Design a protein around this ligand. Structure first.
Ligand SMILES: C=C(C)[C@]12C[C@@H](C)[C@@]34O[C@](Cc5ccccc5)(O[C@@H]1[C@@H]3C=C(COC(=O)Cc1ccc(O)c(OC)c1)C[C@]1(O)C(=O)C(C)=C[C@@H]41)O2
Ligand SMILES: CCCCCCCCCCCCCCCC(=O)O[C@H](COC(=O)CCCCCC)COP(=O)(O)OCCN
Ligand SMILES: CNC[C@H](O)[C@H](O)[C@H](O)[C@H](O)CO
Lengths: 536, 54
């Protein structure tokens, strides 16, 4: 057996299974080879930045991952040394986790992995009827379903959530339960366990709070039980709460604007109240405004502590939370400057006020029609302008310092004024009024016209072509983006909910099968779906 | 028949035809089944925001 730091733990049984030699496997198991050896070398670990073969480190996992069912049945059933179906690796991944890891969302891989998963579950039920493999979590606390949801494996997820077995002695492993069928319509029940209420890590939490790299982040919500769940939750209670929140935010911004507009103009804050109506209403509005700022501040901190987003994806996701938090920061800095007796609180207040209105666009998310504008603004700012700033500032600074150096004595003799005027030229509102008497006028004109041609004509339209391409990229994807935002809203409304109830269930705690492997019956919170399909 | 508000009016002849059982259809017609009963439950009526079979 290999003893190095690269192939640590690899042994002959792995080579026999890997080579697909039934005879050598039978002989090795006969001679007392260890059927639960851990090949955990760096070649065998789960990793992206190094070539390797991760299979779950175990011969049973290797057999399952390589599409060799006969060897699996041999290892599990053979009496020389039977293999434990529920063994786990150093990552804690069992055979089912290993099977999830080797998916790649292709047709043939889906067929292989779905088949092997189904067969292993049936065999596991037969060998250990009291064993529940699907509830075993790996080291990260993920069940195989949660791992599939996080990884974006659409095929495995679609199979599991719509799983049905028409066979006694393993029917309790089904999740989809067809109750009837008519011509185009059929009514079925869906198991729903650990979709909504798992208390540790549900499927919807995993899909919603994924890190935007997941290959099928938005297609996963089209899988039928999830889509029906989100539609039911939306229509049932969440929609009203969302509209109420939007209305309350509108009232808050109206009060804030009215209070801000009527600030006193006298020097040296803070200002003392006179026994007059306008002062009472103004101070009331101020208190409400600062209250709203403090509320959004603590909501922002709670979000960041709960999610723990990384710096690399801090802005790629969580754009809206960052903007609401920055609004809160400007409000608090304004309060600090206010009671510190400085006029400069006006400056801080003003920025928050401006932000307060544009954050209203957050509420157009979740509309099929309107959310595309918020999404387009986000992507344009985060990609195109942030990349383009380096190029444009190189041009601006180059010609700016050139012109400042050339010119002595005038309005174009300081960095500030010349940078502002060159920026004006770039957005097409300059003057070009070459009417001043100064030396080197020809070179000045050549520089300025070169700048105009380079930035106004060329670079600006380069930027516009790129932004237009970005918009046409996501003209098509509106339907999925809408659903994903709706899902995030539904979960966020579920979490707080401000009533002490957690009525997050759909249909009754119905008896699903009634016939466990033991004499008990299973009640499982099934959810009814009446589907229609006009095929044939 | 179904006497509830959802499958109102469905009877054995409709089930026989739906299952594509020619023999059972022949038998039910022979035995005096009503070949003009109206299956007018909400499952069977025209509707938009609900699955059904009109
Ligand atoms: C934190 C960031 C990244 C940000 C905060 C401020 C300064 C911001 O400018 C930027 C940089 C900027 C400034 C000027 C022009 C373009 C970009 O982009 C946003 C930020 C960007 C915007 C414009 O973006 C929007 O359309 C708001 C918005 C879009 C999509 C949403 O989902 C959303 O939900 C909250 C809000 C509004 C400002 O916050 C605003 O009102 C002021 C005064 C400046 C805008 O800095
Ligand atoms: C789209 C791609 C193709 C674009 C091609 C760009 C064509 C732009 C042509 C603009 C030419 C404008 C010249 C300015 C004239 C001027 O303002 O006058 C000039 C000032 O001198 C100069 O700057 C030299 C000429 C500048 C060299 C310029 C390439 C001569 O002297 P006067 O001041 O006495 O003129 C006395 C009259 N008041
Ligand atoms: C309207 N007088 C000049 C404007 O200030 C502006 O610079 C110009 O019209 C735009 O470049 C053309 O739309």
């Amino acid at each position: 057996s290999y003893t190095d730091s690269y192939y640590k733990g690899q042994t002959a049984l792995h080579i026999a299974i890997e080579r697909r030699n039934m005879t050598l496997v039978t002989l090795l198991v006969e001679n007392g080879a260890d059927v639960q050896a851990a090949a955990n070398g760096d070649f065998f670990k789960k990793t992206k930045g190094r070539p390797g073969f991760y299979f779950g480190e175990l011969p049973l996992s290797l057999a399952a991952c390589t599409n060799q069912l006969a060897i699996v049945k041999f290892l599990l059933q053979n009496s020389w040394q039977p293999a434990d179906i529920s063994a786990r690796d150093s990552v804690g991944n069992t055979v089912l986790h290993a099977l999830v890891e080797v998916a790649d969302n292709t047709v043939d891989n889906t067929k292989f992995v779905t088949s092997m998963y189904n067969e292993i579950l049936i065999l596991g039920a037969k060998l250990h009827p009291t064993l529940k493999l699907e509830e075993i979590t790996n080291r990260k606390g993920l069940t195989p379903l949660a791992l599939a949801a996080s990884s974006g494996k659409i095929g495995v997820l679609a199979y599991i959530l719509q799983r049905e077995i028409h066979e006694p002695e393993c029917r309790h492993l089904s999740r989809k339960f067809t109750e009837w069928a008519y011509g185009p319509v059929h009514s079925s029940l869906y198991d729903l366990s650990c979709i909504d209420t798992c208390e540790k890590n549900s499927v919807l939490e995993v899909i919603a709070y994924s890190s935007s790299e997941t290959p099928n982040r938005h297609d996963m919500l089209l899988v039928e039980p999830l889509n029906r769940l989100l539609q039911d939750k939306w229509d049932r209670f969440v929609k009203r709460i969302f509209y109420f929140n939007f209305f309350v935010y509108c009232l808050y911004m109206i009060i804030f604007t009215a209070a801000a507009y009527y600030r006193p103009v006298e020097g040296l804050p803070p200002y003392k109240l006179k026994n007059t109506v306008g002062d009472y209403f103004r101070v009331t509005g101020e208190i409400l405004s600062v209250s709203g700022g403090v509320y959004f501040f603590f909501r922002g901190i709670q979000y960041f502590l709960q999610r723990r987003p990384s710096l690399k994806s801090l802005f790629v996701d969580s754009y809206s939370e960052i903007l609401f938090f920055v609004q809160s920061l400007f409000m608090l800095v304004s309060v600090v400057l206010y009671f510190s007796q400085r006029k400069e609180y006006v400056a801080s207040m003003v920025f928050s006020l401006a932000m307060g209105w544009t954050n209203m666009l957050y509420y157009t998310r979740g509309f099929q029609q309107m959310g595309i504008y918020a999404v387009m603004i986000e992507k344009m700012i985060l990609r195109d302008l942030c990349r383009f700033m380096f190029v444009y500032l190189v041009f601006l600074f180059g010609f700016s310092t050139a012109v400042v150096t050339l010119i002595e004595d005038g309005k174009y003799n300081s960095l500030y004024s010349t940078c502002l005027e060159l920026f004006k030229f770039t957005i097409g509102m300059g003057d070009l009024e070459f009417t001043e008497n100064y030396d080197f006028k020809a070179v000045f004109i050549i520089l300025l016209l070169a700048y105009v041609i380079l930035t106004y004509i060329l670079l600006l339209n380069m930027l516009i072509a790129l932004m237009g391409e970005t918009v046409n990229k996501i003209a098509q994807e509106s339907k999925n983006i809408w659903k994903l935002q709706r899902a995030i809203t539904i979960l966020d409304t579920e979490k707080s909910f401000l009533k002490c109830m957690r009525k997050a269930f759909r249909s009754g705690k119905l008896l699903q099968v009634g016939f466990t492997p033991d004499g008990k019956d299973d009640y499982r919170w099934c959810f009814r779906v009446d589907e229609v399909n006009w095929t044939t």
